[PDB]
């Protein structure tokens, strides 16, 4: 009497990203030396000349502060390519950096390989430099885009031991004779050919989509699934933000946020406060989706000291948050499908195990912590190997012998962190009120915020 799957099932790579939670973007290039956000394609390669670039420093700090993947911008809008591409002369080849022998993608890949940091790349579809970037040279431009994809993803010296985990692309394009058409499908085919199950963020129906929110905040609900016919560059932002309750492909709505107002380094900018980073975390990772956080190196080729300190503060916040699971080993009562799907699985500390029930909704789970504990966060997780299901739930707590509401939500997904006013309680209920199929949970935890 097995539990049948519901909805589209995530790939192993999609589940890996969801589990990894945190990725870093790196914006570094001509724009850094021109103090700007968006280049013209006429920037002087002579100006690309960082005094003391240390990619190993980038990677080491990222790894130490909890990031599991690093996506490197290899060619932004300006079209300046940060590795010595065979396919254009507008690259590091003609810059003074490393006596003109530099390869930023190689230097980051070497470092990332040493630290087992997953790798991704961005090459801007919209290219302000390339003479091929015109409606009348579209086939030519696409062949150029494709050739660089091939150049990067085929070279075993690029990547984390030759492997890329995410290719990232937007869909923006010029106007008039610059309104170039992208051969997205041929690009995705190339990616799969060269890097197999590598995730793709795009505007089309790939494994990752944009969350569609500039602040990095997930919608509520957040279904990690979509109908591919409702995406493209004209996709509705509300649709990206919530996903589709009847979506037919598993899709991660990635939250992309810069640690500063701009994506490139600007001296008169500062990293987001710990407070703001914490809010973003709860509204992204705490809603079941990864945070991709941009950190821009300065003109010296180094992360800003304020930004480095902030990442350590953020890592310390998270490590303190999760230090004590106040629900671990609590007694649970409620309906359960079988012994294999017992209530005790919710707090047993095992990744092997889950709870499930086909009882009529609402389903009530009650935890007895065994002594009064002080908390302000509850975490719930579904088993997405059987598909996303829960659509509404609420949480109640017994405070001084009287039941009161703690918080409520809609989707759970891979992981939901729900904050409430701090309480001291010994008993808690999780009540599932709506679900697309019979609910499972793999874990209920409780924490106190630092």
Question: Would you say 268 is a known binding-site residue?
Answer: no
Q: Is 325 in the site for Ca ion (CB under 5 A)?
A: no
Q: Which residues is 120 bridged to in the sheet?
A: 71, 166
Q: Select 63 or 345, whichever has its Cβ closest to Ca ion.
A: 345
Angle of helix 104-115 versus helix 55-64 axis, rounded to 10: 40
Q: Between β-strands 208-210 and 252-258, what pairing exists: parallel, antiparallel or unpaired?
A: parallel
- DSSP at 448: -
CA distances to 22, 204, 402, 419 from 424, in Å: 31, 47, 12, 14
Q: Select 139 or 350, whichever has its Cβ closest to Ca ion.
A: 350
Residue nearest to Ca ion (CB): 353
Q: Select 328 or 399, whichever has its Cβ closest to Ca ion.
A: 328
Q: Between β-strands 225-226 and 443-447, what pairing exists: parallel, antiparallel or unpaired?
A: unpaired
Q: Which stretch binds Ca ion (CB under 5 A): 15-23, 157-165, 229-237, 337-345?
A: 337-345
Q: Which two tokens stand for residue 408?
A: 């409520």
Minimum Å gap between C-beta 282 and Ca ion is: 23
Q: Between β-strands 166-168 and 199-201, what pairing exists: parallel, antiparallel or unpaired?
A: parallel
The answer to whether 124 touches 75, Cβ cutoff 8 Å, is: yes
Question: Would you say 350 is a known binding-site residue?
Answer: yes
Rounded Cα–Cα distance for residues 182 and 124 (Å): 11
Kind and range of the H or E element at 64?
Answer: helix 55-64
Q: Is 381 in the site for Ca ion (CB under 5 A)?
A: no
Question: Would you say 106 is a known binding-site residue?
Answer: no
Among 139, 161, 177, 350, binds Ca ion (CB under 5 A): 350
Q: Is 328 in the site for Ca ion (CB under 5 A)?
A: no
Minimum Å gap between C-beta 349 and Ca ion is: 7
Binding mask 408-447 for Ca ion (x = CB under 5 A): ----------------------------------x-----
Q: Select 111 or 444, whichever has its Cβ closest to Ca ion.
A: 444
Give the binding-site size for Ca ion (rule: CB under 5 A). Answer: 4
Q: Is 329 in the site for Ca ion (CB under 5 A)?
A: no
Among 353, 408, 433, 449, binds Ca ion (CB under 5 A): 353
Rounded Cα–Cα distance for residues 260 and 264 (Å): 8
Phi/psi-derived region of residue 65, left when phi > 0, alpha when psi is between -120 and 50, beta in every other case:
alpha
Q: Is 333 in the site for Ca ion (CB under 5 A)?
A: no
- Positions 266 through 285 that interact with Ca ion (CB under 5 A): none
Q: Which residues is 392 bridged to in the sheet?
A: 434
Minimum Å gap between C-beta 255 and Ca ion is: 26
Minimum Å gap between C-beta 325 and Ca ion is: 12
Binding site for Ca ion (CB under 5 A): 345, 350, 353, 442
């Amino acid at each position: 009497k097995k539990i049948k799957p519901h909805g589209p099932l995530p790939s192993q790579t999609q589940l890996a990203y969801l589990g990894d939670e945190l990725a870093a973007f790196i914006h570094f290039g001509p724009n850094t030396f021109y103090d700007q956000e968006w280049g013209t394609g006429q920037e002087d390669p002579e100006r690309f000349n960082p005094s003391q670039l240390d990619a190993r420093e980038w990677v080491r700090v990222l790894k130490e502060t909890g990031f599991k993947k690093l996506i490197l911008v290899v060619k932004h809008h300006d079209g300046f390519v940060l590795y010595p591409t065979a396919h254009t002369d507008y690259s590091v080849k003609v810059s003074p950096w490393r006596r003109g022998k530099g390869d930023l993608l190689l230097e980051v890949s070497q470092a990332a390989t040493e630290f087992d940091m997953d790798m991704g790349v961005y090459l801007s579809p919209w290219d302000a430099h390339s003479p091929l970037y015109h409606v009348d040279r579209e086939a030519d431009y696409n062949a150029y885009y494709l050739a660089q994809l091939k150049e990067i993803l085929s070279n075993p010296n690029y990547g984390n031991a030759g492997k890329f985990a995410e290719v990232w692309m937007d869909g923006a394009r010029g106007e008039g004779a610059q309104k170039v058409n992208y051969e997205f499908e041929k690009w995705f085919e190339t990616i799969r050919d060269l890097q197999g199950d590598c995730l793709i963020f795009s505007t089309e129906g790939t494994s990752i989509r944009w969350i569609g929110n500039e602040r990095g905040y997930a919608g509520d609900p957040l279904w990690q699934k979509v109908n591919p016919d409702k995406l493209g560059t004209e996709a509705e932002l509300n649709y990206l933000q919530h996903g589709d309750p009847s979506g037919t492909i598993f899709s991660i709505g990635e939250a992309d946020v810069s640690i500063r107002p701009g994506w490139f380094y600007h001296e008169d900018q500062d990293p987001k406060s710990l407070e703001e980073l914490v809010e973003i975390y709860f509204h992204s990772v705490g809603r079941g989706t990864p945070l991709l956080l941009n950190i821009p190196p300065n003109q010296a080729g180094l992360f800003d000291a304020k930004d480095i300190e902030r990442l350590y503060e953020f890592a310390t916040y998270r490590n303190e948050l999760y230090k004590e699971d106040l629900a671990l080993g609590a007694e649970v009562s409620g309906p359960a499908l079988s012994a294999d799907f017992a209530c005790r699985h919710l707090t047993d500390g095992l990744e092997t195990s889950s709870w499930a029930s086909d009882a009529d909704l609402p389903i009530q789970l009650e935890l007895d912590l065994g002594s009064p504990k002080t908390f302000d966060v509850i975490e719930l997780r579904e088993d997405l190997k059987l598909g996303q299901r829960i659509a509404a739930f609420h949480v109640q707590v017994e405070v001084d012998g009287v039941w009161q509401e703690f918080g409520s939500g809609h989707t759970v997904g891979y992981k939901r962190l729900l904050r409430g006013a701090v309480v001291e309680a010994q008993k808690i209920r999780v009540v599932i009120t709506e679900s697309q199929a019979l609910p499972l949970l793999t874990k209920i935890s409780l924490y106190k915020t630092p």
